[PDB]
């Protein structure tokens, strides 16, 4: 203008959106235990 001020206004672009925070419950695997060696007792079945 006569003072040096613009006629066509400036751009005001859209800022970045707030994101959604993400996590994860990652999982592992330990196997089952190997069954041991059986030992014959000296007592009968009700006692042992």
């Amino acid at each position: 203008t006569i003072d040096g001020q613009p006629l066509s206004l400036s751009l005001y672009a859209t800022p970045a959106d707030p994101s959604m925070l993400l996590s994860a419950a990652i999982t592992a695997s330990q196997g089952g235990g190997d069954l041991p060696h059986a030992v014959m007792p000296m007592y009968r079945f009700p006692v042992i």
Binding site: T27, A28, S29, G31, G32
Partner: protein, 49 residues
């Protein structure tokens, strides 16, 4: 074509009503899963075995 437009509209409104993304229904629906064997699958194997 107008049937496919109507389908896309009712599916999109269904998605935004349920607050699900397209990735959600894709995870719930697809056949393009990966075939790698996951510790979740392994836990299912040994638990149910």
């Amino acid at each position: 074509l107008t049937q496919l437009i109507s389908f896309l509209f009712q599916c999109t409104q269904w998605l935004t009503t349920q607050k699900w993304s397209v990735s959600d229904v894709f995870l719930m629906t697809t056949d393009n899963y990966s075939t790698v064997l996951t510790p979740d699958i392994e836990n299912l194997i040994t638990t149910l075995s």
